[PDB]
Design a protein around this nucleic acid. Structure first.
Lengths: 213, 227, 171, 154
RNA sequence: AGGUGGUGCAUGGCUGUCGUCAGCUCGUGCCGUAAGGUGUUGGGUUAAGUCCCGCAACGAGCGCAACCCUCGUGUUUAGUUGC
RNA sequence: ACACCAACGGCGAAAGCACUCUGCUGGGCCGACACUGACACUGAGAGACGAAAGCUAGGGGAGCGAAUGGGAUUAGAUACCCCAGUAGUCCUAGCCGUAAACGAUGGAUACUAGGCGCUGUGCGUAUCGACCCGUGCAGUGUUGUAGCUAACGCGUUAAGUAUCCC
RNA sequence: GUUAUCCGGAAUGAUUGGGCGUAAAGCGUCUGUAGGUGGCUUUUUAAGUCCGCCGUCAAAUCCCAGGGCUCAACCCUGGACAG
């Protein structure tokens, strides 16, 4: 139907993530390496913080290869929640990430950064409405709660679409709320979006968050 | 005190009313005579209701408020502006929008944009952009210049609104009746004294009768500011 | 766009609100058949101060509060002289809903149909009895009581209007 | 508070509207000439037609009407008439359709007069009004600026 | 564990279509008891609800267009593996 | 059977009524006090009239035209189209008594804004004569205040306010 | 608890209390008998109407106030508006 914004704006105002420049067979193998790194980080923090309390919200995992050394930046909003306090979080990340890249034993620097305002970053906010919506809370309370929760934290325009099988139904719906300008067509406009799938008990839900900044 | 001699109105176009088979008969205990296809307004109750008019205008400004006057007719267009620059009041230039009193939130935001565009018009950065942006700013600034040019100095609602006679501004009048804002206006020979709750029934065919009652109320307001 | 509307909601101790019906009213379009919510909110303090208001919007709560903002600009005060009851009996129709209101003894809670009882239990009257003659409607019903309690006069203003000095009244 | 103030205002006015109702008491070229509505000069008749006389008046187009012309007791002429004559005309209706001006002799106009109390005080304030009128009329310059600091209405 | 077993009428994601058609709505106000209308209708003009005038409407969001790529012409700069 | 005249026109209680003229005869409207002095309104049952089609009896029969007959269209056509065409249409004397017989609004009286009209008469102006202006009424129409109405609308000819009678 | 019967709700037979342009409903219109209602002033009788008094409408029931059964149900004593 409609093209998605992070695909559409790639020439200008949106940059790629897996930022390493290579040759075809080495392109396929570098894409192997990228996918296993994002797997180990996602599954890692999901396990070692599933035992912990709250949601983490890792938005971007940028992977860069200057020399035979791999800079990995992790853009989560709540980075104090991760570490085992001396630095041992990112150290054990570096262990399990070293577990699946040592073809050529090249060094890698896993860093971690802060999101400027974590409510304004659609992967994190989509994780929040995912978490509250995965708990038994209605679409309206949680979704308006995400809206005023966002507009207290300085966002120009917003669109929230939540897909089928809301609280008790056997007929799917779509429910979208918009505030302000969200021009999806304006190429300069810099809209960042996320598309998170909530795996509930009585079905699957789909959340798709557009944020115009 | 606020008197007007009976002869100053009786000489001019005050009893010089309107058409004799167009009368709206809620003036049937009011209108004095009829001659040559033109009505003749009773001037006693006219001047008494003007005595009451200046009592209730000068008292209301003696409390300390801001008054409003509507100007739209193009027969009494600039005479209201002469009757509003000296009198400190904010005024309608030529034409009215339905919603300038009751829907005043959007009118207020429209004054945010009109204030910002006057700030850009004064600042001398108008000649930066080419004829497209200057054309658009001149057009919207021309339309807001048509309406909001004469009421820049108002926030909120007035206390008393005095309007161009009856015909063209039933819109603004009915916004005043919805808001409850008391209005004291002019009545033709064929209109309602019960739209507003006190008004001044005199024909407005004469420009000098319009200048008479409006000039009278202009000194009423300015002496209201005299404190 | 300041946020959370904490000061701006005006916590509504002054006016307590209730719906009296929320019917989903629907219109059909080229694409299909889509509905909005018409809610009827009766606002009013128990001091003697009520008024109805309709609203409709695609959300439920925006229709309720939108009807409330329509309602809290539409207020009459209730002429209720005695120990929270009525001066005299009254009847006044609106549209095709007729409402007979009748004052009561103080040992009688308000007994009326759901719309009339809703605008009287919000009106702070305690002792009335109002039969409804006519429609099954709720809006024209309640608005017919509002017209049926505007036109109602105390003894002090009828004594003021007639000019009769004062007698014929127990209190 | 604002709503309450508004209500109080409305009450004041309704009482002010309660005290004293009781007691008390050819044409195309002329059309081309009318590019602009302003400027009276001595009314020029440039067409004549029963219903009225059509009259150029300093750049403004006027309409005299028969009932508003001088009564004619003289032997000969067409009533309404006017051909090219130049007549002192007072500013009346100012016709709204096409933005004209109407003109009216208006007659003898004798009206019955009822005596009004306080004319002793009523002449004095009429005099005061005339003095204010003499102080009024100011031809040139525009007020404005007064400098100040502009602020948001919110 | 595995299931390319069933149900696309339990779903998500993705997509086609009407159709790149020019619309679809909302806030506030007004009208109607109300469903609703009004804006968005009318006079012109556009590929366009594009823009202008009048109008109880005033504004705004998504739509259209532009910003995006490519092919068009020229200038500055760099000349290899290209001239 | 009666073109133009024909009009959102006149009359009748309704149905109806238009080529003109004559005869008999109904009804309406207006004025003067000229007279009587409440004789008024409605009306069960009753009685009369009552478009068109229908029927009895006798005339008459050009046009039109159910039924019918033929041709066409059509898969088919008992129908629309076309060509013939009988009862009927008209008149005399009756019977029948129904119609969207509609203003889809029983009748009567009293009262409650106006604008624009038409018809009939009456007064005054103007002339001295046709006009022409206002009006007093009655009737007919069109927009419309109040009020009523579920709404559309009706609104001095109410679907308003009241009273009476079926 | 279900069923049946009756009243309510039901202003859904309407005096209190409905309707008849279009929702069910104004006869096709008109004359008129019986009958119904009816202008104003003055006077008379009082049939209706109103006021007083008197008689009666059994007792029991219902209403008020007492009293009795441990209370109540029930029983008993006295009183009376209506009409």
């Amino acid at each position: 139907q409609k093209i998605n914004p992070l695909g559409f704006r790639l020439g200008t105002t949106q940059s790629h993530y897996s930022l390493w420049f290579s040759q075809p067979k080495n392109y396929a193998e570098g894409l192997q390496e990228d996918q296993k790194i994002r797997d180990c980080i996602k599954n890692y923090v999901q396990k070692n913080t599933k035992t912990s309390s709250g949601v983490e919200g890792i938005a971007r995992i940028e992977i860069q290869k200057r020399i035979d050394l791999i800079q990995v930046i992790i853009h989560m909003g709540f980075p104090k929640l991760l570490i085992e306090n001396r630095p041992q979080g990112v150290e054990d990340l570096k262990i399990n990430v070293q577990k699946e890249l040592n073809c050529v034993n090249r060094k890698l620097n896993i860093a971690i950064t802060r999101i400027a305002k974590p409510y304004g970053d659609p992967n994190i906010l989509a994780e929040f409405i995912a978490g509250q919506l995965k708990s038994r809370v209605s679409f309206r309370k949680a979704m308006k709660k995400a809206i005023e929760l966002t507009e207290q934290a300085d966002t120009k325009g917003i669109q929230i679409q939540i897909a089928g099988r809301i609280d008790g139904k056997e007929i799917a719906r779509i429910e979208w709320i918009r505030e302000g300008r969200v021009p999806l067509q304006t190429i300069r406009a810099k809209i960042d979006y996320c598309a998170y799938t909530v795996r509930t008990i009585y079905g699957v839900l789909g959340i798709k968050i557009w944020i115009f900044m | 005190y606020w008197n007007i001699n009976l002869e100053e109105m009786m000489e001019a176009g005050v009893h010089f009313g309107h058409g004799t088979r167009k009368w709206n008969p809620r003036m049937s205990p009011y209108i004095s005579a009829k001659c040559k296809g033109i009505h003749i307004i009773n001037l006693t109750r006219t001047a008494r209701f003007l005595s009451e008019a200046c009592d209730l205008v000068f008292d209301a400004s003696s409390r300390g408020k801001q008054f409003l006057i509507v100007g739209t007719k193009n027969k009494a267009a600039d005479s209201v502006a002469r009757a509003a620059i000296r009198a400190r009041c904010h005024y309608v230039n030529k034409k009215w929008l339905g919603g300038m009193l009751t829907n005043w939130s959007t009118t207020e935001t429209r004054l945010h944009k009109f204030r910002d565009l006057r700030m850009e018009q004064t600042a001398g950065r108008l000649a930066r952009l080419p004829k497209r942006d200057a054309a658009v700013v001149k057009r919207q600034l021309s339309h807001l210049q048509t309406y909001l040019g004469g009421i820049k100095y108002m926030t909120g609602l007035p206390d008393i609104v005095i309007i161009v006679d009856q015909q063209e501004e039933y819109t603004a009048l009915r916004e005043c009746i919805t808001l409850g804002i008391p209005t004291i206006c002019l009545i033709d020979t064929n209109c309602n004294p019960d739209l507003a709750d006190i008004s001044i029934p005199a024909n407005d065919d004469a420009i000098a009768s319009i200048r008479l009652i409006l000039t009278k109320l202009v000194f009423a307001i300015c002496e209201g500011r005299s404190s | 766009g300041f946020g959370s509307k904490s000061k701006k909601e005006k916590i509504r101790d002054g006016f307590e609100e209730n719906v009296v019906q929320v019917r989903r009213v629907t219109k059909v379009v080229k694409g299909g058949k889509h509905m909005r919510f018409r809610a009827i909110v009766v606002v009013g303090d128990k001091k003697g101060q009520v008024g109805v208001g309709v609203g409709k919007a695609k959300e439920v709560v925006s229709a309720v509060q939108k009807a409330a903002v329509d309602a809290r600009r539409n207020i009459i005060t209730v002429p209720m002289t005695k120990y929270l009851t009525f001066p005299h009996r009254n009847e006044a129709d609106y549209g095709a809903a007729r409402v007979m209101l009748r004052p009561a003894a103080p040992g009688t809670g308000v007994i009326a149909g759901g719309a009339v009882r809703t605008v009287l239990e919000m009106a702070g009257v305690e002792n009335a009895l109002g039969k409804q003659l006519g429609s099954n409607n709720a809006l024209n019903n309640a608005r017919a009581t509002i017209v049926a309690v505007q036109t109602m006069r105390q003894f002090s203003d009828v004594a003021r209007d007639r000019g009769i000095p004062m007698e014929e009244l127990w209190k | 508070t604002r709503e309450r103030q508004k209500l109080k205002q409305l009450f004041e006015d309704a009482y002010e509207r309660c005290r004293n109702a009781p007691m008390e008491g050819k044409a195309m070229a002329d059309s081309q000439a009318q590019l602009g509505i302003g400027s009276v000069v001595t009314g020029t008749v440039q067409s004549l037609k029963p219903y009225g006389a059509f009259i150029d008046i300093g750049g403004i187009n006027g309409l005299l009407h028969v009932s508003q012309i001088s009564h004619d007791r003289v032997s000969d002429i067409a009533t309404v008439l006017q051909p090219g004559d130049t007549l002192k005309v007072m500013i009346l209706s100012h016709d709204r359709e096409r933005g004209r001006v109407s003109l009216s002799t208006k007659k003898l106009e004798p009206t019955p007069g009822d005596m009004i109390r306080n004319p002793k005080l009523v002449f004095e304030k009429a005099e005061e009004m005339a003095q204010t009128f003499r102080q009024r009329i100011a031809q040139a310059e525009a007020m404005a600026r007064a400098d100040m600091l502009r602020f948001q209405p919110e």
